Write an enzyme that holds these catalytic residues in place. Structure first.
Site, PDB file in Angstrom:
ATOM      1  N   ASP A 187       0.833  -1.199   0.000  1.00 12.86           N
ATOM      2  CA  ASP A 187       0.000   0.000   0.000  1.00 12.86           C
ATOM      3  C   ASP A 187       0.869   1.250   0.000  1.00 12.86           C
ATOM      4  O   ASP A 187       1.910   1.308   0.682  1.00 12.86           O
ATOM      5  CB  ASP A 187      -0.927  -0.004   1.208  1.00 12.86           C
ATOM      6  CG  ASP A 187      -2.152   0.866   1.028  1.00 12.86           C
ATOM      7  OD1 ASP A 187      -2.300   1.479  -0.036  1.00 12.86           O
ATOM      8  OD2 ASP A 187      -2.992   0.950   1.971  1.00 12.86           O
ATOM      9  N   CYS A 218      -7.969  -2.054  -4.807  1.00 13.82           N
ATOM     10  CA  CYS A 218      -6.971  -2.339  -3.850  1.00 13.82           C
ATOM     11  C   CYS A 218      -7.608  -2.277  -2.468  1.00 13.82           C
ATOM     12  O   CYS A 218      -8.581  -2.907  -2.276  1.00 13.82           O
ATOM     13  CB  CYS A 218      -5.795  -1.430  -4.015  1.00 13.82           C
ATOM     14  SG  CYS A 218      -6.196   0.308  -4.307  1.00 13.82           S
ATOM     15  N   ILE A 222      -7.883   3.614  -5.046  1.00 15.18           N
ATOM     16  CA  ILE A 222      -7.370   4.772  -5.740  1.00 15.18           C
ATOM     17  C   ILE A 222      -5.870   4.761  -6.117  1.00 15.18           C
ATOM     18  O   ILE A 222      -5.515   5.189  -7.167  1.00 15.18           O
ATOM     19  CB  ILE A 222      -7.657   6.085  -4.995  1.00 15.18           C
ATOM     20  CG1 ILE A 222      -7.260   6.006  -3.557  1.00 15.18           C
ATOM     21  CG2 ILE A 222      -9.120   6.369  -5.042  1.00 15.18           C
ATOM     22  CD1 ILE A 222      -7.251   7.320  -2.831  1.00 15.18           C
ATOM     23  N   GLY A 223      -4.995   4.259  -5.256  1.00 19.64           N
ATOM     24  CA  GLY A 223      -3.578   4.429  -5.542  1.00 19.64           C
ATOM     25  C   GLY A 223      -3.032   3.388  -6.498  1.00 19.64           C
ATOM     26  O   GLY A 223      -2.718   3.693  -7.660  1.00 19.64           O
ATOM     27  N   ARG A 224      -2.951   2.146  -6.021  1.00 18.87           N
ATOM     28  CA  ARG A 224      -2.482   1.057  -6.882  1.00 18.87           C
ATOM     29  C   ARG A 224      -3.442   0.861  -8.047  1.00 18.87           C
ATOM     30  O   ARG A 224      -3.013   0.631  -9.186  1.00 18.87           O
ATOM     31  CB  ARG A 224      -2.317  -0.235  -6.073  1.00 18.87           C
ATOM     32  CG  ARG A 224      -1.141  -0.115  -5.073  1.00 18.87           C
ATOM     33  CD  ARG A 224      -1.134  -1.208  -3.992  1.00 18.87           C
ATOM     34  NE  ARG A 224      -2.193  -0.996  -2.990  1.00 18.87           N
ATOM     35  CZ  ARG A 224      -2.344  -1.775  -1.912  1.00 18.87           C
ATOM     36  NH1 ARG A 224      -1.548  -2.815  -1.723  1.00 18.87           N
ATOM     37  NH2 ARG A 224      -3.316  -1.499  -1.024  1.00 18.87           N
ATOM     38  N   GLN A 262      -1.858   7.789  -5.810  1.00 16.48           N
ATOM     39  CA  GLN A 262      -1.819   8.535  -4.563  1.00 16.48           C
ATOM     40  C   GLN A 262      -0.512   9.278  -4.344  1.00 16.48           C
ATOM     41  O   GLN A 262      -0.536  10.385  -3.787  1.00 16.48           O
ATOM     42  CB  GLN A 262      -2.106   7.590  -3.398  1.00 16.48           C
ATOM     43  CG  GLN A 262      -3.558   7.385  -3.164  1.00 16.48           C
ATOM     44  CD  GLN A 262      -3.842   6.442  -2.042  1.00 16.48           C
ATOM     45  OE1 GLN A 262      -4.542   6.787  -1.080  1.00 16.48           O
ATOM     46  NE2 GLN A 262      -3.328   5.260  -2.136  1.00 16.48           N
TER      47      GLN A 262
END
Ligand code: VO4
Length: 283
Positions: A187, A218, A222-224, A262
């Site tokens: 993460d 994830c 949003i990030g990965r 992110q």
């Protein structure tokens, strides 16, 4: 192809990674589109359906459930390549909570989604990231009136492939989903191995079906998730000899789900990976 050639856009990207301009422009891009309302996600009955209190879908692009309680923390994210008659459809969502697994499987069923891409482990350094919403073989689960069974489980160094049979218990109807879980990507970080990541994105692309969304999640969604979407988009562009502007890809995602990609290190990673895919494609 309008602003530059592919070759020109890659020279710009390479020069801008070295000079710092590419990350400076990333840092100035909005993370949440001003002007898009976020109201349903904040309703008292929906608060416990959000894994992270302020990672929320926009009203306009949120996925609706049928019935009295229409809410899931999930967003339609569609990536156009207009010069190619091509839209890559996604549903970007969070890792389900114990009490939202029923809504997660409802989306899969209602849209007969054949591919789920999970980019997190269940837990990380003692922190819960995702509820296990599928059974171990040969157990079964029931979520919201769907019976779930795992037909196969094949592990690799970086990811797990599972075939899941989803049965509507009230009608006996059956639907099969391919479930891919990438376990080597922490993460707020980058993939442990860049080559494993690119092989995996390839594999995802091979399983995509025309005009059907890929469900990607994830923990927060949003990030990965955003890094994967950016990478798949870029691979489609390089193969078609179309210019790639990662900043605009990220902006186009963020107009559909806030905060995708992110961290600046995640952005730097995907930009470097884009250059690698481009250079390999020249061979
Ligand atoms: O669980 V993700 O933080 O990469 O949105």
């Amino acid at each position: 192809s309008n602003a530059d050639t592919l070759e020109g856009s890659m020279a710009q990207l390479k020069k801008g990674l070295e000079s710092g301009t590419v990350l400076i422009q990333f840092e100035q891009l909005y993370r949440k589109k001003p002007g898009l309302a976020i109201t349903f996600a904040k309703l008292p009955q929906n608060l416990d359906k959000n894994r992270i209190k302020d990672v929320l879908p926009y009203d306009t692009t949120r996925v609706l459930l049928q019935g009295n309680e229409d809410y899931i923390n999930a967003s339609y994210v569609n990536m156009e390549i207009p010069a190619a008659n091509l839209v890559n459809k996604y549903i970007a969502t969070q890792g389900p909570l114990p009490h939202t697994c029923a809504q997660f499987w409802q989306v899969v069923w209602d849209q007969k989604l054949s591919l789920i891409v999970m980019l997190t482990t269940l837990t990380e350094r003692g922190r819960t990231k995702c509820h296990q919403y599928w059974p171990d073989p040969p157990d079964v689960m029931n979520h919201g009136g769907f019976h779930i069974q795992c037909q196969s489980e094949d592990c690799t160094i970086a990811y797990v492939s599972r075939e899941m049979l989803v049965t509507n218990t009230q009608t006996g109807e059956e639907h099969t989903v391919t479930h891919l879980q990438y376990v080597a990507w922490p993460d707020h970080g980058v993939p442990d191995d860049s080559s494993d990541f690119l092989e995996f994105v390839n594999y995802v692309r091979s399983l995509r079906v025309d005009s059907e969304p890929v469900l990607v999640h994830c923990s927060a969604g949003i990030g990965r998730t955003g890094v994967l979407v950016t990478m798949e988009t870029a691979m489609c562009l390089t193969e078609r000899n179309l210019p790639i502007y990662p900043l605009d890809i990220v902006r186009k995602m963020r107009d559909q789900r806030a905060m995708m990609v992110q961290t600046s290190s995640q952005y730097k990673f995907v930009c470097e990976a884009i250059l690698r895919v481009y250079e390999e494609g020249l061979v």
